[PDB]
Write a protein that binds this ligand. Structure first.
Ligand SMILES: CCCCCCOC[C@H](COP(=O)(O)Oc1c(O)c(O)c(O)c(O)c1OC(=O)CCCCCC)OC(=O)CCCCC
Ligand SMILES: *[C@@H]1O[C@H](CO)[C@@H](O)[C@H](O)[C@H]1NC(C)=O
Lengths: 132, 420
């Protein structure tokens, strides 16, 4: 909760805010400040940072996806996109939009959403098919 | 209504059920030789799922089945394997009874011609005889059921099985002489696959031949019956078309089915001559070939009619073969329908020029289709040229087989008139 990162030039001020999900804080360098940057005081902000030990990093950002193609020949395959919810307290809705360029003829009766090993029926389903 | 036909049926359904429950069923259903964009179970299920989603099945390039198919498999979606067993059994039954009646008619004509002695004296082992025609209907049903083409078409759950059942019932009703049911089944088949329209010419002829109506210009009765049958056929077709409109309340099945059959926009590989030709075709100059290749199917109907006027069942067989070979998106179950007619014409097995080599070519091509398909789709070892060459060889074999049968038939007729 203390011991921020070390930046060599003393910053103008510090701005602490909830930016995406976490209360993160920034050092501010106001370029419209003749104290920070003169006509002959060019500013080279330095940041001491290296990949932190695994017991010191944020876990995962509560949501990520990974799309890939199943099957191995031609003439057939599967567009599958894993999407992860790493929050161990809260289900949340996710709107997935897919565009497939009409030379991978999709079979929408094969659309499965497991989400636990069970089957997850989407709350809202919209599908426009492709005209060659 | 037969002692061994029931055994044939039980063996056929046993084989088909074993294949359905085996692990080869998925592979067979994904086979591209037995499944076309027009006759795909996966596509039928896709259209039903689109209806479940509320989007029209024809607002896309994946579904091309008819509204009657939609209606039928809406209710029989769960019993599909049993439905396909039933429809192949119905095809076999219709072919059995049609060929039985046709053999009876043929022997009657041969007797009525031997009475007035229009044959040459040098004809003894050249006339159809009741002991050699006793098992012809059974062999017809046997070729229809117990050949790999129909078995694969059933296991893949292709609607080409439904098309075959409709065409076989058209043959049965025409042979029995039911002009109304003939027109209904011909309209259903034309509504399904768009290339039984040519079969309108043989059936009518046989119908006239069954009514002893002369087929000649200065004959009022011939024109009366032709107009009656044509109006029944066209009226049945238009009623089915309007009903199919009312199923979805839109004329979207019309383009997506018939213009899909006629314009060939899919280029999915087949056993036919269209896919690769139209994949590797020049942009301009391509509509001319669509036109000529569609005219090909309808081209021989009139000349074969005016050459086989007195033989409308052989003419019907040749027409079915021409449709099967020249066709947008043909499955190998379309080949089975005319191959089931071979025992009807096995008495021509002394004038067949080259049957051995053609049968070998067809068998080798049939067993090379999956092999080379694997070699350029799943293995990168081959390319599309291998499959194209196998399609060319298969279709040339089919043409030469049909031409050999037609030549043998004409030669047998000539030897019936002139001594050998
Ligand atoms: C009707 C029967 C045969 C039909 C055509 C056969 O020939 C086509 C294929 C060639 O297969 P491929 O794709 O490996 O080879 C090529 C390339 O890879 C490439 O990149 C090129 O640029 C090429 O030009 C090229 O060869 C060619 O163009 C072929 C030139 C021959 C034309 C004759 C007038 O034959 C067979 O394999 C099947 C064996 C036939 C019997 C089962
Ligand atoms: C830069 O600006 C401020 C005030 O002018 C101060 O840090 C210093 O006097 C200036 N010059 C340099 C070289 O830092």
């Amino acid at each position: 909760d203390n011991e921020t990162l070390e930046v060599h030039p003393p910053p103008t001020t510090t701005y602490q805010d909830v930016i995406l999900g976490t209360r993160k804080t920034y050092a501010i360098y106001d370029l419209l400040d003749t104290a920070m940057i003169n006509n002959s005081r060019n500013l080279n902000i330095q940041l001491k940072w290296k990949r932190p030990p695994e017991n010191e990093a944020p876990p995962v950002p509560f949501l990520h996806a990974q799309r890939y193609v199943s099957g191995y020949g031609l003439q057939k395959g599967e567009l599958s996109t894993l999407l992860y919810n790493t929050h161990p307290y809260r289900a949340f809705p996710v709107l997935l939009l897919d565009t497939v360029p009409w030379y991978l003829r999709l079979y929408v009766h094969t659309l499965t959403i497991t989400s636990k090993g069970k089957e997850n029926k989407p709350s809202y389903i919209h599908y426009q098919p492709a005209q060659d | 209504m037969a002692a061994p036909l029931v055994l044939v049926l039980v063996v056929a359904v046993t084989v088909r059920a074993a294949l359905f429950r085996s692990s080869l069923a998925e592979f067979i259903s994904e086979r591209v030789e037995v499944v076309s964009p027009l006759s795909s179970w996966k596509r039928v299920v896709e259209g039903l799922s689109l209806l479940d989603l509320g989007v029209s099945p024809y607002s896309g390039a994946v579904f091309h089945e008819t509204p009657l198919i939609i209606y039928l498999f809406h209710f029989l979606i769960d019993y599909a394997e049993l439905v396909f067993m039933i429809t192949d059994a119905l095809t076999a039954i219709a072919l059995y009874f049609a060929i039985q009646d046709f053999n009876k008619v043929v022997f009657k004509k041969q007797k009525l011609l031997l009475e007035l002695d229009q044959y040459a004296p040098d004809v003894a082992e050249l006339i159809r005889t009741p002991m050699e025609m006793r098992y012809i209907p059974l062999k017809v049903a046997l070729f229809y059921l117990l050949n790999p083409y129909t078995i694969l078409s059933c296991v893949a759950k292709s609607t080409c099985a439904i098309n075959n059942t409709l065409i076989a019932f058209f043959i049965l009703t025409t042979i029995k002489g039911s002009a109304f049911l003939s027109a209904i089944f011909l309209a259903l088949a034309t509504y399904q696959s768009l290339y039984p329209l040519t079969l309108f010419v043989p059936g009518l002829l046989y119908l006239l031949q069954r009514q002893y109506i002369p087929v000649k210009m200065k004959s009022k009765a011939f024109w009366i019956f032709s107009w009656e049958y044509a109006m029944m056929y066209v009226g049945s077709l238009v009623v089915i078309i309007c009903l199919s409109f009312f199923l979805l309340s839109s004329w979207d099945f019309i383009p997506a089915v018939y213009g899909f059959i006629l314009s060939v926009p899919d280029l999915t590989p087949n056993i036919g001559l269209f896919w690769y030709f139209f994949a590797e075709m020049f942009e301009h100059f391509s509509l001319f070939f669509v036109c000529v290749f569609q005219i090909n199917v309808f081209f021989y109907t009139i000349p074969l009619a005016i050459k086989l006027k007195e033989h409308p069942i052989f003419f019907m067989f040749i027409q079915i073969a021409v449709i099967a070979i020249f066709k947008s998106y043909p499955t190998v179950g379309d080949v089975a329908l005319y191959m089931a007619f071979f025992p009807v014409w096995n008495h021509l097995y002394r004038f067949l020029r080259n049957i051995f080599v053609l049968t070998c070519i067809i068998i080798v091509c049939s067993l090379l289709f999956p092999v080379l398909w694997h070699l350029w789709i799943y293995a990168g070892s081959a390319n599309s040229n291998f499959f194209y060459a196998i399609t060319l060889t298969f279709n040339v074999g089919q043409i030469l087989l049909i031409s050999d049968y037609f030549y043998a038939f004409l030669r047998r007729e000539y030897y019936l008139t002139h001594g050998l």
